[PDB]
Design a protein around this nucleic acid. Sequence first.
DNA 1: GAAGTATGTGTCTTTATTCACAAGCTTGCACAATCCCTGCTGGACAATTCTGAGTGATGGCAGCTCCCACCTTTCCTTCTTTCTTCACTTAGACTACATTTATTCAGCATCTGTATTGTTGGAGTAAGTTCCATGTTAATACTCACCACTGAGGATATGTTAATACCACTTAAC
DNA 2: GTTAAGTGGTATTAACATATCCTCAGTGGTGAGTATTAACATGGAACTTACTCCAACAATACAGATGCTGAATAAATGTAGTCTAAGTGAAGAAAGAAGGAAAGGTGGGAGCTGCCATCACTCAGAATTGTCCAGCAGGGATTGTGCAAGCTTGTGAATAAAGACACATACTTC
Lengths: 111, 97, 96, 95, 108, 119, 140, 83, 82
Amino acid sequence: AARKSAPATGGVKKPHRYRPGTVALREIRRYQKSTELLIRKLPFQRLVREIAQDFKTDLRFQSSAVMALQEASEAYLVALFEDTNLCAIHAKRVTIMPKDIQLARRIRGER
Amino acid sequence: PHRYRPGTVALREIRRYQKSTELLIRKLPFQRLVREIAQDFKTDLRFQSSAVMALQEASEAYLVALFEDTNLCAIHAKRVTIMPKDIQLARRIRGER
Amino acid sequence: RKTRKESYAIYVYKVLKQVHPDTGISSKAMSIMNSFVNDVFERIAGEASRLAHYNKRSTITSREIQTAVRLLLPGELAKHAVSEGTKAVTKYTSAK
Amino acid sequence: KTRKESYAIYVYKVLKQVHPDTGISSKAMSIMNSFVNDVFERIAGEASRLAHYNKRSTITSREIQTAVRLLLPGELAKHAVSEGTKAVTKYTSAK
Amino acid sequence: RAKAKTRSSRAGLQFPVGRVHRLLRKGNYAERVGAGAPVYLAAVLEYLTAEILELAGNAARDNKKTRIIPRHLQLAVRNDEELNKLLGRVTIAQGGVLPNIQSVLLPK
Amino acid sequence: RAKAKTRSSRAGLQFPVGRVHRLLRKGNYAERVGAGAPVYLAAVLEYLTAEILELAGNAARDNKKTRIIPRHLQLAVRNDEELNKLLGRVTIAQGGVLPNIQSVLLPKKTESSKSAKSK
Amino acid sequence: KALQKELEQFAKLLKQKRITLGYTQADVGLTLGVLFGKVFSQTTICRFEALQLSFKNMCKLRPLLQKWVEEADNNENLQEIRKRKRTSIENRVRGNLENLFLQCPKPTLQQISHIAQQLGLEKDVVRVWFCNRRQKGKRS
Amino acid sequence: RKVLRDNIQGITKPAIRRLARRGGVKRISGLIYEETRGVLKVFLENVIRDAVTYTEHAKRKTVTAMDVVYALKRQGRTLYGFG
Amino acid sequence: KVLRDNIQGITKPAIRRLARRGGVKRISGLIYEETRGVLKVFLENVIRDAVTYTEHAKRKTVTAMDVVYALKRQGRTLYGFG
DNA sequence: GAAGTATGTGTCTTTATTCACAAGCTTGCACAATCCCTGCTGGACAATTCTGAGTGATGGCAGCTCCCACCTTTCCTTCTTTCTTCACTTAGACTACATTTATTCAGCATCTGTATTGTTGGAGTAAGTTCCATGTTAATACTCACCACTGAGGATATGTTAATACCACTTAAC
DNA sequence: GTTAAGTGGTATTAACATATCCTCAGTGGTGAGTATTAACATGGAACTTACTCCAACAATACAGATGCTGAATAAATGTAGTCTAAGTGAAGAAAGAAGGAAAGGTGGGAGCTGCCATCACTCAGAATTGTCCAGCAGGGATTGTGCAAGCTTGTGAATAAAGACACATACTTC
């Protein structure tokens, strides 16, 4: 059918902008080369103490105890995002959705 | 003559096999497969009757549970047909690939 | 005569006759229930054995068993199992 | 301070064999110490129940060999079995 | 000499405290075993046994059966949220599966 | 009394046979422990250590480092098909992940065809 | 007289309407065929819009195009939803026929039938080609 | 002295279809059956290899139910009802 | 409003960084709330077991070994902390 | 949309099947009583390590604005899978016998625990040092928007010739 | 004899094959621009090396529990054959599911800016943990006793199996 438009455009000066996915791919390479913890330590440390209040009051934590929790927590979340990414690609997407997390966790045996 | 639609009988099979508890693989074909696999590990191997039966209960439980995971991968991809790509994804997430 | 083989069959049956006086059990379900008790025994005793090793203890006590129960049984199961275990030790201690 | 034993010097002895001009960080040695401890319990735990299954009171090199075959994946299992029997052969021949 | 009373009767249990004590002693768990450990363990084992048998007898009654078979144990364990978690990685022989069909597979 | 010789030296092992024997005896594994069990276990433990350290030492040389860090242990373990199966449920602290981007996420290479055009 | 300039003005406006309506010259011939029955080839439309055809032909095709431009403006979809067949002669047939000349300029129909069967051409095609051969040879 | 071969094909397509029905599958691709046979062979090889390892350690020549049960437990696949 | 619930201290950029190390290229906006719920469940299971080891030892401080023991008990062995 | 029809599942009854429950026997293990001793407990005390507070600097986050590539919906084609039928091919059952193996003693070999002594390997602490993280710089490589080149297919212009058409001459009919 | 049709003869006409040209799509080449990589110098902290010392290991003897070999043998699995019906395999027709194309829209990405919450550091205190030492009671070891539990038989209740009847649902027709 007659589906036509006007392809008018122009440019004089424009600050450089990367396409939607160039920086995201750059970030994947950056954070897969690195080995540091990706969650801030103080916000995570507060979360650990908040959760532990449900189990015991006036609980003390060693510095390495919170660090051991953080290393395990991010390892669990990074590995879960690897399974979540596979489900998104399985469903012919590149965007991970909450249903991909739920499918990955269900197959693992957590749901 | 009488013809059911493509999927009415399949749902009927799902209900009857989820209601029963018997083994769904023939015993002799499975027993022969067990003895063939064991030949790679030790020549002149004997098997108890219950040793093969235990292998069949575990094998069918493993396969039924994998098809449940496989089915969820098919529905996730907006399908009702389970495909080999669904078995591969289910086994990869489980940690077998 | 065949060698004696111990099982929890007579004890699982006694427990059954309290919860369901008129209900019986087949020998295949009794064999599954015997495997369940043995499997849970190794879990609790194995977990309690590690607790003594962690704390440099040479004895497994009801305190090690109680901690193992809380570590293995989930949620409402652990709370009731601790209640039954504590009630039995209290009753056993008061007797002799 | 009370003494705390670890496999640090033995892991360093092995490292100086395979890679003479290579060091190891203290965090990596903590990981390598955990690896040796973890594998020790896996083999000793499997060997312990092998004796229980077979109604044996003694853990021998046969229980250790079977536990290595059950736990290690294939090429690791047959190389470790070769190393284990080679050491037991050398140990017996020596004294 | 005093007439023997089993440690199960002292604790008011059905499971054998004396046998559980021997299995703890000979299972290579610790150098020593306390007096209350077999009593605590037999009480926990007896409770977990009664939990399954209660739910399995109900499933047997729901099928008009007066005898528990492996199918009823499977139904009891999988229909209890906590027992299914305890026995999550456990296969019950001749138990089958739960009758669950996905809603997207049903006819319109 | 004769001169002392370590059981590690008799077997030719760097790992301690006498200490492995003690850990077996006090680990509550069996009522008795044979003489060859600590020798076999120490030789297996030493072999696995050399396997990891050989691969991790290779990794350090690729990053032009003369010192193994946890990153190199993770790279060594995860790049070996058999060490990755042995340590499949193990988390190595400060180890990171293997660099791996799924091929469907990589940008579409330059190419263009022509569909039916009515303009 | 002024019919020349009136035709020229009509042709320029005809080109403008054809370009505005989005119709190719082959499409113009197809429309003329499906609305009158005398389908014309796109070469004729080219020679028209460029004003190449002869004056008599100019006047002859004026009315058909007038009617088409005055009619097609209403609806195009339904319209969208008899050539003077001119068989070509391939070069070897041309050479063979030239060989058949230089000996018998005007063959009889008895020989014409044989020639037609020999080279696989229609009798009417061979007859008209023979006539035009004579015609162009008598030009000079 | 007897030898066997071509026995994975004895796990027939109807038998695989029944297993998918108990798994709640309504529609099955044509290439599932070959994929399933490879999946079962890998699973059975792992369990039998451990079962024979338990058998040869016991200095035995017959594989008992306990050897299978022990092997399955070692894979995290505890099986109730066989000892 | 400023962040109130502690779980909210696991910021969206922090979750995006974890997805980048996981190879994720594009993230739905509902992932972050799902990820915070997932982490809170994981931490509850580990901390509950880590405290259970602590109260058994009759201590008040949670040591690194309690976390390591709790992780191992869940089939998530962690190396490098004892 | 109902009526109607065919198929399948469920339900109640009757009857044979089987398998669980109880009675009877023996054996080994649980209890009772006793003695011994060491692991665990409670107290006191040093010391150590974690919590709470304050501080300064800055970088990471939160909120924002575009805008475009991705997800979702709709529509259509195709071809894969389902359902049914029918021939036939093994599985299941069951006897019967052959062959291997797992169990049991019995005697003896040998291997491990236990105790004691002496030393030496390994852990902790201290000095000695060199690898690596950090910075600055430069070079290289990647991304992205702009400019342009050119080839392909369709659509026009040509050269050229089949094909018809107009006209003079002859020839056939009433 | 006159008039309409057939036969040629020459002028016009219009379509074919191929020659040009318009326009649009695909490359790509390209500078700017940004980010990653590599070189090089430097300080420090994190490693390696060298010393005490002390607890764990080895050497030595010996007792006794554990395992070995051979014999005999019962238990158990394998092997083969026979028969019947339950299940499998192949084929054919067709429904509908899978997948591609197309369009739209919206949600997520990239980038920008301001600020506040994280981080690194320090300190002071108190709460906790570790060590040491006495001591005593809980647990092991032992022996004698008996009775609970396992094995072996035996039977009535539970379950499976027809068999007929009653739905309940599905699918085509009207």
